[PDB]
């Protein structure tokens, strides 16, 4: 017994959109609770969110949540769960009105060039919905929503352990989850945070590529603890490549541009999206709009420049006002990273890695799921996940733009509202012996003793190069097949890696190293999944199976781990809600 233990009734790994929403909510119910974060809470990736929060408020035009279900189901490609999607869309309106009462800087309706209305939150148009239901605070919605929640947590005096790095979860003799270990980046000391509920809210991790909209932070840490410990990982092949990123930068530019009237064109001046998606035009689903541009690039018919093979995003036709009022954020991101004032010229965009559908399979209440001998669903004791690392099965094969944030809050909060109940259901959980905890430090001790190994930059660069080619937008059996091997090489290679800096005071490297194991363990299952699925749906796009296998592949691909041992593969399903919704054609 030599490690420090901080006992909490709860531990929330990650202080972003969903973490802070649940952190705040768990605190509400007189529950002791610690909230951890790799960076200062407001730096979390959620600040970069732009678009808005799509939710049927009925502010811009009459509406109803059901149209939100249909618009989403068709967006997931009938692989998203009706029960979760239902709850989410119904509980949506309130959940959001709620943030407005906390002070969220929403934009409002009234006097405009040709529009007028009271005070309600303004809803801009987004891809996947028939009209406008996307509530946003100009071009910076996420920045508004993250800061608001931090202010709330500031107010409701939540316990925050800023800049603390979670290492690995800690398993109970009876195979449960009783907390986790963590390094305080500042002091460099290590500590075990014991808790009756451990909530992963580690976010996404599109950093397993070379060009991503994500931050240097999204390094699957959540994924690589849920595996290193034994918990499955659903639809890990489902990666959303945002239609409009910045060429060479990866920096995103809100789909809200098309929502305000933006053009997605080719060098020959035509609107290939009006062609690819006849009636739904540039407002088409994510996956669809993605390939269309990536195609005019294989055919050698995509604009080029100092930036690279791209497609023009014309916005200059809108008002210089509408641009500075409704998209002030874009104007700066285009001028800086893309040397192109949008008010006078289109923007160099390319479909780049954005959102990460798959992640820890969880029920509405946020509890993490695994399988049984028969392959049944068996709730993991002490573990819950909410957010992006979570795969509650609400986005399926293709996340409908603007819903992520909605997910953050609705489920993050649901994770909180239901916690007391959940901890009851699982009953007490037994302590963890010096051995159980010791297990979680194994990864740490590795890097700290292996001082002569191999330079980690190469491994990272390789890990990113591969994943970029073999599993980009389009992919095929042999591709996956090849990289799926390059990986094993590197995954082993990575086992001899080294840690040059070994100091205590703010070891920037140790964290990046540590994040690496996670970047690896992630992309891995990613591949095993991408390959396994023999069908063409949403994000997943194979040339050997150009159509969706409705009978064999209408399910969730569940990657089965065993820590560092051998891997596997599996399935899961779900279409029994309340009003009922059947499969169909996907013509945007």
């Amino acid at each position: 017994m030599k490690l420090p233990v901080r006992e909490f009734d709860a531990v929330v790994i990650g202080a972003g959109g969903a973490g802070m929403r649940a952190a705040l909510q768990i605190s509400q119910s007189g529950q002791t609770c610690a909230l951890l974060s790799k960076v200062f809470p407001t730096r979390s990736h959620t600040v970069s969110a732009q678009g808005g929060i799509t939710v049927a408020l009925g502010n811009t035009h009459e509406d109803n949540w059901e149209w939100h279900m249909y618009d989403t189901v068709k967006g997931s490609d009938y692989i998203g769960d009706q029960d979760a999607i239902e709850y989410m869309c119904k509980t949506g309106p309130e959940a959001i009105l709620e943030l407005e009462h906390m002070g969220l800087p929403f934009s409002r309706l009234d006097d405009g060039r040709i529009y007028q209305r009271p005070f309600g939150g303004q809803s801009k148009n987004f891809g996947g919905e028939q009209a406008a239901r996307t509530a946003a605070a100009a071009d910076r919605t996420g920045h508004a929503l993250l800061h608001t929640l931090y202010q709330q947590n500031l107010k409701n005096h939540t316990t925050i352990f800023s800049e603390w790095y979670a290492l690995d979860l800690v398993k109970n003799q009876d195979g449960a989850v009783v907390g986790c270990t963590a390094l305080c980046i500042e002091t460099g000391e290590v500590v075990y945070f014991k808790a009756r509920a451990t909530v992963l809210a580690t976010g996404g991790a599109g950093r397993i590529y070379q060009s991503t909209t994500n931050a240097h932070i999204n390094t699957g840490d959540g994924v690589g603890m849920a595996i290193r410990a034994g918990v499955p990982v659903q639809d890990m092949e489902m990666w959303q490549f945002h239609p409009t990123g910045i060429a060479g930068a990866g920096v995103l530019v809100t789909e809200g541009c098309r929502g305000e009237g933006g053009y997605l064109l080719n060098k020959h001046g035509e609107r290939f999206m009006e062609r690819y998606a006849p009636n739904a035009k540039d407002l088409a689903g994510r996956d669809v709009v993605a390939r269309s541009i990536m195609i005019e690039i294989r055919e050698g018919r995509g604009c080029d420049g100092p930036w690279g093979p791209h497609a023009k995003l014309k916005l200059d036709h809108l008002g210089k006002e509408v641009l500075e009022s409704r998209l002030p954020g874009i104007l700066e991101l285009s001028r800086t990273f893309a040397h192109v004032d949008p008010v006078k010229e289109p923007i160099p965009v390319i479909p780049t890695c954005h959102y990460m559908m798959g992640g820890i399979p969880t029920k509405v209440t946020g509890q993490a799921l695994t399988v049984n001998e028969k392959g049944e669903d068996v709730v993991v004791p002490g573990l819950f996940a909410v957010g992006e690392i979570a795969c509650v099965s609400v986005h399926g094969a293709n996340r409908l733009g603007g819903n992520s944030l909605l997910d953050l809050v609705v489920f993050g909060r649901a994770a909180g509202l239901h916690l007391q109940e959940s901890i009851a259901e699982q009953g007490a959980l037994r302590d963890a012996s010096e051995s159980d905890v010791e297990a979680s430090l194994d990864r740490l001790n590795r890097w700290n003793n292996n001082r002569n190994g191999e330079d980690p930059v190469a491994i990272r660069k390789a890990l990113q190069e591969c994943m970029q080619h073999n599993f980009s937008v389009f992919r095929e059996g042999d591709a996956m097949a090849k990289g799926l091997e390059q990986l094993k090489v590197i995954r082993e290679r990575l086992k001899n890696a080294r840690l040059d800096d070994t100091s205590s005071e703010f070891n920037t490297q140790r964290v990046e190293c540590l994040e690496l194991d996670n970047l690896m363990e992630t992309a891995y299952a990613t591949a095993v999944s991408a390959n396994f699925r023999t069908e063409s749906r949403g994000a997943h796009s194979r040339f050997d199976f150009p159509d969706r296998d409705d009978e064999n592949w209408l399910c969730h691909s569940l990657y089965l781990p065993e820590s560092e041992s051998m891997t596997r593969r599996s399935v899961n399903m779900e279409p029994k809600l309340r009003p009922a919704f059947p499969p169909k054609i996907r013509t945007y």
Binding site: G103, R108, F119, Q509
Partner: protein
């Protein structure tokens, strides 16, 4: 070409007093990169070199740094803007705050003042709304240039009045925040907030030096806000 750097170094467990270490980077001469980019490279050369960063697009406030005697964000300070032959590219921490390691300052007293001015809405709930709060665009317009701060700690870090009274004077970033809720239609404790700032230090340490405006990554103007807060003060207590 070859790029020359002069960086601040300090490991409490190695160094018993700070120093500047020399760095060279033969970055491709095709185009220019961001100072963060440069930093990450040297980071590969030297792993003991540490600094903060994340969103990378100038929206998180992570890489707050003083480059060439002027504070700014590394993720967007073009190398162009820092290269001048013969001489080097100086890079030090943000002035004023305690240095944790190399170019990473303890942002303690910053966040501290942030809280003092109550960074959250305070509505007495009188006259509840049916759905959301009544907010005419004209009013909401008033929050522009206030809710955008990213707490990058650049301005406060560039204000003499802050270096002298970190703990008493609220500083530029907090004062913008104070004002953010002073003019929010939805905040009903305006008078209460005003009384809370009427001492000799909180607001009145500002002498209109303006380095804050001068350096703000997000183009915000703390001095203009402070002058307003001061004006609401005269209105209420004179």
């Amino acid at each position: 070409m070859r790029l020359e750097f002069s960086i601040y170094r300090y490991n409490p467990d190695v160094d018993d007093a700070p120093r500047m270490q020399d760095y060279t980077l033969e970055a491709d001469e095709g185009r220019d990169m961001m100072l963060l980019d440069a930093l990450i490279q040297l980071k590969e050369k030297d792993p003991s070199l540490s600094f903060r960063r994340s969103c990378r697009e100038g929206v998180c406030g992570s890489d707050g740094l003083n480059m060439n005697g002027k504070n700014g964000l590394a993720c967007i300070t073009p190398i162009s803007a820092l290269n001048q032959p013969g001489k080097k590219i100086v890079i030090r921490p943000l002035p004023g705050l305690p240095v944790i390691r190399d170019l990473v300052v303890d942002m303690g007293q910053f966040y501290a003042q942030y809280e003092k001015i109550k960074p959250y809405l305070l509505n007495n709930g009188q006259n509840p709304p049916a759905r959301e709060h009544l907010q005419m665009p004209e009013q909401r317009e008033k929050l522009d240039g206030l809710y955008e701060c990213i707490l990058c700690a650049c301005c406060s870090t560039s204000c003499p009045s802050f270096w002298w009274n970190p703990d008493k004077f609220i500083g530029p970033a907090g004062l913008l925040a104070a004002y953010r809720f002073l003019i929010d239609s939805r905040d009903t404790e305006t008078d209460s907030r005003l009384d809370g700032l009427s001492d000799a230090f909180s607001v009145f340490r500002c002498h209109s030096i303006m380095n804050c405006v001068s350096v703000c990554p997000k183009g915000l103007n703390p001095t203009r806000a402070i002058g307003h807060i001061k004006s609401m003060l005269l209105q209420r207590n004179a």
